[PDB]
Design a protein around this ligand. Structure first.
Ligand SMILES: N[C@@H](CCC(=O)N[C@@H](CS)C(=O)NCC(=O)O)C(=O)O
Ligand SMILES: N[C@@H](CCC(=O)N[C@@H](CS)C(=O)NCC(=O)O)C(=O)O
Lengths: 207, 207
């Protein structure tokens, strides 16, 4: 399988952790977005939305990090523990995946991107939206070790890419006791944390 | 199964169409956002994020519309046509769902919500981003009657709630040939479209 990717990109680093956790070897291919390499007809033909991460699996094209996480586990995972079959457990993991995209990482992008990519000054009402997101995650984590169920899942792995993006950008989330404890634990147990951490240093350069 | 909803809300209307599509009668519970009902300890105890739609299915709490679509189809669907078992088919549906939330509906919300809910003026740069989203949907649909396969899926139903939202907000998508054709066919074959359209006139009051 091919993975078009940049190491700094959080949704790329989530795919890379899941591929490591299930022991799947990916053919990794850098795509220079600041160059506009992704807008090539070469890559549009693979993915008309021209986004990373994109996977090509024996010619089947797939994008959206979180659709890829599900598919890699479903098709390729030896056990279904990262994404269990039980629809209730799956359903909690899916909700946590939509949260990670539209609440958590979205608030993160919204606050930090305009500072680093368009130079605008910090907007303190987007700061609050961001903290209100982490607070939600804190709440989800109450009395829990992992984000969904009592087990490492693709929900943790996705949220781990996102929350390591938070740290490297300078957001101290120590005040959220459950998130901090989950973060500390997730680094110890997630396969390919160390690769994700390396990739966060390329992401750190934006700041 | 109880569903806390408001009939104008697109993510609620998407769930109610899927329920209709599979023959599931929900107990529909109007949750009055306009009067803070969702923020009270009773609803916060069901969903700590206090968002609609929220399903309560025999004790099991669940939110995020697109998690609910999958869960309903997996549990109550007579067949799996709306969400097939095959990981590759499933993966194209999941990508469109993440597309729906994170690209299409997101652009719509960014452009229109500051106007209707905060009374900010229209932002022509957020307008452009919203048009680029519709163009990507047009591309996805080249040569296709449906959004993610040869058949109607939960991907078309989610997308149908979003695009009927675009309609009553006044967005002109006459210009996208593929979107036009798909939208016309979807209104025809999708169960509960008529009720969706009724709920859209409630949303349209905000304009
Ligand atoms: N929701 C997507 C987010 C992907 C994304 O944001 N990609 C950006 C990273 S900079 C990108 O490729 N931007 C360039 C473009 O859209 O053309 C996912 O989870 O995979
Ligand atoms: N991404 C969610 C969005 C749901 C959502 O944002 N619901 C709003 C509708 S007004 C809500 O309940 N907001 C009130 C609140 O967030 O407290 C989904 O698709 O279910």
């Amino acid at each position: 399988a091919d993975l078009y990717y940049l190491p700094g990109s959080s949704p790329c680093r989530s795919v890379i952790m899941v591929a490591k956790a299930i022991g799947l070897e990916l053919n990794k291919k850098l795509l220079d977005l600041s160059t506009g390499e992704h807008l090539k007809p070469e890559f549009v033909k693979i993915n008309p939305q021209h986004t990373i991460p994109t996977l090509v699996d024996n010619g089947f094209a797939l994008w959206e990090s979180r659709a890829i996480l599900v598919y890699l586990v479903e098709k390729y995972g030896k056990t279904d523990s990262l994404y269990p079959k039980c629809p209730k457990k799956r359903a909690v993991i899916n909700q946590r995946l939509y949260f990670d995209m539209g609440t958590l990482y979205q608030s993160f992008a919204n606050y930090y991107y305009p500072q680093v990519f368009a130079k605008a000054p910090a907007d303190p009402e987007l700061y609050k939206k961001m903290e209100a997101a982490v607070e939600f995650l804190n709440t989800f984590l109450e009395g829990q070790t992992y984000a969904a169920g009592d087990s490492l899942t693709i929900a943790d792995i996705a949220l781990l890419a996102t929350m390591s993006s938070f740290e490297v950008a300078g957001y101290d989330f120590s005040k959220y006791e459950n998130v901090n404890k989950w973060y500390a634990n997730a680094k110890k147990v997630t396969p390919g944390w160390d690769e994700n951490w390396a990739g966060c240093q390329e992401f750190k350069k934006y700041f």
